[PDB]
Amino acid sequence: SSRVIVHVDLDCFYAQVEMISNPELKDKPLGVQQKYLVVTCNYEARKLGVKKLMNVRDAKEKCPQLVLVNGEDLTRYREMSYKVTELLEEFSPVVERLGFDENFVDLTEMVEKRLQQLQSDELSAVTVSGHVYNNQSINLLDVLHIRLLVGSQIAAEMREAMYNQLGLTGCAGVASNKLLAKLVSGVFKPNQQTVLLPESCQHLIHSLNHIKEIPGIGYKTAKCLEALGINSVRDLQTFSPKILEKELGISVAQRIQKLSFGEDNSPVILSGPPQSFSEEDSFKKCSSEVEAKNKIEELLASLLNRVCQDGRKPHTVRLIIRRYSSEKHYGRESRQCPIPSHVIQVMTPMVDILMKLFRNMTLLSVCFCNLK
Amino acid sequence: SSRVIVHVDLDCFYAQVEMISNPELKDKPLGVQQKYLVVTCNYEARKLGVKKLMNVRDAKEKCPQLVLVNGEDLTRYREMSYKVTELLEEFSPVVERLGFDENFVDLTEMVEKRLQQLQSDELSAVTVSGHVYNNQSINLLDVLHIRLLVGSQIAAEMREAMYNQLGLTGCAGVASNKLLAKLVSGVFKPNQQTVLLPESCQHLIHSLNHIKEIPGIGYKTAKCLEALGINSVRDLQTFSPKILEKELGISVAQRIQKLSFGEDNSPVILSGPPQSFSEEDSFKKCSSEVEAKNKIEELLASLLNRVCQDGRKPHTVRLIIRRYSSEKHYGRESRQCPIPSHVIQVMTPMVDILMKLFRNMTLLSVCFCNLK
DNA sequence: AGGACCC
DNA sequence: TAGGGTCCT
DNA sequence: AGGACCC
DNA sequence: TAGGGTCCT
Ligand SMILES: Nc1ccn([C@H]2C[C@H](O)[C@@H](COP(=O)(O)OP(=O)(O)OP(=O)(O)O)O2)c(=O)n1
């Protein structure tokens, strides 16, 4: 039944990687730019009002002294992101990734094995490592407190190792499920860790200011919950299970309502190798509709290099697009087809499929999937 | 590279099972009825003009002395169909099912292991078991002939065992890929077997009278191939790879054209346990739209009994429908939702999901999928 | 194919 | 206003 | 969700 | 004109 889960969430991930590559960017406010977006910035920059995902413009008139490096090519972020995951897999094999810089790890077996190693005595010497959310008092006779503390120690070891082995700093959150571990990992933001004891669960959940902040409720469900009067986490908690049930479906409803309480049973799943490999190119206005094929070969050349290296081969290929007038707020199109078996065991053939796949049809991408 | 594949295809499967249950139906022309459809009939009935999938009416004015048993409930056909597959898995583990009464088995490893058991002498005594398609002469110095013959013998053993162990008769086809093995299994129809030597491949493929007859080309691609002038297997063979490529997609095109030649690389896949469990009920006009919920509980009661017995549990549930005016030639609708985790470890809850799933929405069905 | 959600 | 990624319907 | 194909 | 089933987009 009761779990100890850690969420590890690195500091300003892309910026960190670029500050390690070029030390002269440390102590300078640094943004990482992709097109006209400053996708992230180091903490010197955020002191100056730069926020995650500003446009460049907004960001250099909040802070004109900002250095920008291009981060369009994710290769090095991707590589560091797998080094991180593989280090954490060493502590416990079941690591779930979320984007390039978050991992969840179910520490439940590891905590219990450390607890049985202690003799009935040093158990009163168990302390916490890091902060305790809401400054809550620990009760060393509460078996759950104890386990969560041991879980804070495992966390501190994982962060130390990330630092010593890969040069990376990060936050960690320790709690009894993934939702709470992830909410509590951000309470002390820069390169620290927090542990949630069960008595403070409602305080954390109610510290949120809109239901969008609950992992699991996105841009669309939020706009829905509103249209009904449901604005705070408490409105969602107290709202009618029925009317909700019959509006968002039985699945989305009964789940998001659980979450509004801090309750989340989802297991930490082994992410292992990726299920897809894609790259992309943005260029607003530039795809005449054929001129831009030389674009399709570029995407291919990288992708083949990557897909290769893994071992596994993809058995499906896909092509994706969008097109331009006023804000069509969601609108990409794709054509999918198997990859013929003779080609699986090079470029030149891969480029055709992708053109014809372009004919059954701002910006362009290729995706390899269905790996084996 | 070169394979020996067998396709096993049982005689009038449902009728066989009902003639074994009630011996008094043997030697009588027997049809198995589902609603107004005689889905299949034993060979005494087909002498009298009864064909597979006639309406009852048509079928009893071609042969008014026809006995009919109801076959709406597939339980016993399903059970016999897994006994068959599991027997064939005993000869070689990789057995692919197709519907309830066809299996493919890749005999390639088994043939080669029997060949290395023979000393360089009794290899000239290898004979065939069953017919040889097109009455083709065997060449005992042709390693491919030899292997195919040994493959005919394995086939005869599998059919004998099916008979001795389960009481069932069937045809088998032996050839170098699945397409050809399946085409050649029907040449000698009632309870016999045929083997295809490579020199006669084109004769078999050209013996077909319309491209619909090629496994792989269905009701829709056929209507397409027509709209273009492609009517015979030879028209498909000689038609332009390009114009085809750019009309049915690169995938459907390059594959169906291979097939038109007798070429088919698809591997025999291990079907193992099912990926879904459903039942259905037809009743044309009867679903007022709620009255008919008592229908939804009936489907559930069986399904739960089955899903159970396997071991594995389903994590998804689905509900399916159609509705009625003139011939909407395809038109079923479904609502899917996860099954909550507390319910996975009974009826009563399963009935609700399925109603609400009915509200987001002739005939009705429930499907359990996503087993684990 | 496309939707919805995440970083 | 990027460039990726996951699983569900 | 629905399409297409198979028995 | 049944009652099932598989995998792809
Ligand atoms: N919409 C998004 C979200 C994030 N990222 C990228 C840039 C980030 O460096 C990285 C990790 O996302 P985080 O929300 O973790 O942001 P940071 O690690 O950069 O900031 P923090 O220190 O607040 O955790 O993924 C992105 O490209 N697009």
Ligand SMILES: Nc1ccn([C@H]2C[C@H](O)[C@@H](COP(=O)(O)OP(=O)(O)OP(=O)(O)O)O2)c(=O)n1
């Ligand atoms: N459209 C279909 C096709 C078949 N079946 C069922 C009834 C059959 O008994 C069984 C196997 O299908 P076959 O084409 O193999 O038909 P038979 O085994 O009945 O006839 P045969 O002796 O020609 O192989 O599946 C069905 O219900 N609906």
Ligand SMILES: [Mg+2]
């Ligand atoms: Mg993060």
Ligand SMILES: [Mg+2]
């Ligand atoms: Mg981060």
Ligand SMILES: [Mg+2]
């Ligand atoms: Mg058959």
Ligand SMILES: [Mg+2]
């Ligand atoms: Mg049959």
